[PDB]
Write a protein that binds this ligand. Structure first.
Ligand SMILES: C[N+]1(CCCS(=O)(=O)[O-])CCCCC1
Ligand SMILES: C[N+]1(CCCS(=O)(=O)[O-])CCCCC1
Ligand SMILES: C[N+]1(CCCS(=O)(=O)[O-])CCCCC1
Ligand SMILES: C[N+]1(CCCS(=O)(=O)[O-])CCCCC1
Ligand code: NA
Length: 552
């Protein structure tokens, strides 16, 4: 264009005007906060001590640091503030949030409604924590296909609920329905991790209070800080655009660039403005008070074989009083392992041998294939509960195939064998890494890790309980686009107990990264871990033996 190159002073004159603008607005905000330097003390000038959780927070006593977290979020309410709970992973931000909701309901008579927006991969966990910790709090889970969400719209429109639990996707897609509601509180769980969503909330959603859950401290990313600032403190700049868009609106045409020191200049001011509204405690400073056992739901993918069989079964079933209970059972066999159907095993594994098909065909086995070595490599010992005995046979084949030493106990086990199996497992130097247990058939306090494979311990140790659930399956309903599951890094974050283990977990993830078959390093085949559609013949896509399978 008209760029006589010495005009670069024109971009710089615009950048200086834009930076100066950002500094004076944030200075005005801080000047105002201090007029009514310790900005925390002046922001939280109204105190209220919290000594005990609400009576309706049932099923667990808050830890001391969780009580102080509840007290801090209550200070946001009393002082008419928005805020950010940035506690490190493992401090129970989910539980603290439910403690805030119950406390506001019980003590302050704030019935709701409460808007809780969570990563799809943790939705099921959230739903479960609400059922355990706050059963009296009326809850709507807003997810699924459009015909499943229409059944909610009546209850939602009438306001006959207190908590609406949903994901970012439906906040955007179903805004015409959800933005009609006058929300009391909007809580956004950004996971540990942290586009369109911020604009949708800024323009259409009416809430009286806002809270962000994050797992990291305030970062050095301008885009993320900017998005946080404009959600927590929307009136300073009143813009739904990203930082880059906001910064470059003068030329709405080349991107104005900030020097390294200009970026740091902007980052520190945005940090300073947000600090009085941020609470973050570290695991190392509350280590003595950390809880006894914590439970996490882990969502698992379907393999292409499971997905194919599942769609076919469901279709055949809709064509058709406990014959409906049988259909539900068939879907549950699939979610556990396709090979529980003998016909599927014969077609897929005609050689009738133990190989990588054991874990490539079942999303739960493929997950266990990754995390069981991590536990083994960090000194832990695993109890595994099964509702279906038939899956225990397949698990035995897989464990033997991986060389993992286990014991097994079910209703077939004779009474004197049960005691001997327990005695062996409880031994100090037991070579047995795992205990396979039928839930129908105990003092297993040498194991600190518990995996509930499906559904219908520990000595002074952090006991961890994992509940495996197939995404988008009948298993989700029984427990009652966006990435349905979490990746290895996020998985390492919630399975590792300290920093020494997280390093061990990551070292194993890099060793797998260089596997000749499944690795993604250069010189590796890059074969997918879960079976893919191209690996399947034209089966289960009319055929009688496949309808008996669906309703058996
Ligand atoms: C925030 N506040 C008053 C708000 C009361 S309201 O009914 O509008 O929700 C002020 C300090 C006392 C505790 C609650
Ligand atoms: C956080 N905030 C906003 C008011 C709280 S509100 O939920 O209504 O948005 C901003 C400036 C003063 C301190 C309160
Ligand atoms: C750089 N900073 C924040 C420094 C951190 S402070 O200790 O002062 O709170 C932000 C922009 C204005 C000048 C102070
Ligand atoms: C190539 N391969 C071989 C797996 C090795 S196995 O021990 O299970 O035989 C089989 C096809 C899927 C990708 C892995
Ligand atoms: Na946001």
């Amino acid at each position: 264009a008209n760029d006589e190159e010495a005009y670069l002073k024109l971009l710089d004159q615009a950048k200086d005007t834009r930076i100066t603008h950002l500094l004076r607005q944030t200075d005005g905000f801080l000047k105002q906060l201090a007029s009514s330097i310790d900005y925390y003390a002046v922001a939280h000038r109204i105190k209220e001590e919290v000594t005990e959780q609400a009576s309706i927070l049932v099923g667990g006593t808050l830890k001391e640091y969780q009580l102080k977290g509840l007290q801090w979020m209550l200070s946001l309410y009393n002082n008419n503030l928005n805020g950010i709970l940035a506690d490190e992973m493992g401090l129970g931000k989910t539980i603290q949030t439910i403690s805030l909701i119950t406390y506001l309901i019980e003590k302050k008579h704030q019935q709701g409604p409460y808007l809780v927006i969570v990563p799809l991969s943790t939705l099921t966990n959230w739903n479960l924590e609400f059922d355990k910790w706050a059963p009296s709090v009326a809850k709507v889970v807003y997810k699924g296909p459009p015909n499943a969400r229409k059944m909610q719209q009546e209850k939602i429109r009438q306001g006959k609920f207190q908590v609406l639990l949903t994901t970012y996707e439906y906040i955007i897609k179903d805004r015409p329905l959800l933005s009609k509601i006058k929300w009391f509180h909007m809580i956004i769980d950004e996971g540990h991790r942290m586009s369109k969503l911020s604009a949708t909330i800024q323009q259409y959603y009416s809430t009286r209070f806002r809270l962000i859950l994050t797992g990291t401290p305030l970062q050095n990313n301008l885009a993320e800080l900017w998005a946080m600032l404009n959600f927590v403190l929307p009136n300073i700049f009143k813009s739904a655009k990203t930082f880059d868009e906001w910064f470059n609106t003068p030329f709405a045409q080349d991107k104005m660039e900030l020097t390294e020191e200009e970026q740091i200049l902007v980052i520190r001011r945005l940090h300073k403005v947000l600090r009085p509204f941020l609470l973050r405690r570290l695991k190392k400073d509350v280590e003595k008070d950390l809880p006894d056992k914590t439970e996490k739901v882990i969502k698992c993918k379907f393999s292409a074989l499971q997905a194919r069989l599942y769609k076919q079964m469901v279709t055949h079933q809709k064509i058709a009083a406990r014959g409906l209970s049988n259909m539900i059972m068939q879907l549950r066999k699939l979610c556990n392992h396709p090979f529980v159907f003998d016909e599927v095993e014969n077609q897929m594994n005609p050689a009738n041998v133990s190989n990588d098909l054991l874990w490539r065909t079942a999303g739960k086995f493929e997950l266990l294939d990754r995390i069981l070595p991590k536990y083994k490599a960090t000194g832990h010992r695993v109890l595994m509960f099964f509702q279906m005995t038939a899956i225990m046979d397949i698990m035995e084949d897989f464990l033997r195939f991986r060389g993992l030493h286990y014991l097994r106990l079910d209703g077939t086990t004779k009474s004197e064998d049960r005691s001997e199996l327990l005695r062996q497992f409880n031994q100090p130097d037991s070579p047995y890494f795992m205990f396979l247990l039928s839930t129908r058939a105990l003092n297993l306090q040498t194991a600190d890790t518990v995996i509930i494979y499906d559904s219908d311990i520990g000595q002074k140790n952090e006991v961890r309980i994992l509940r495996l659930i197939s995404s988008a399956s009948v298993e989700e309903k029984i427990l009652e686009g966006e990435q349905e599951e979490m990746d290895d890094d996020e998985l390492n974050m919630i399975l590792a107990r300290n920093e020494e283990e997280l390093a061990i977990f990551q070292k194993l993830d890099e060793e797998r990264s260089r596997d000749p078959i499944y690795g993604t390093a250069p010189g590796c085949q890059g074969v997918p871990r879960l079976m893919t559609e191209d690996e399947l013949p034209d089966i289960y896509l009319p055929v009688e033996e496949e309808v008996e399978m669906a309703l058996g």
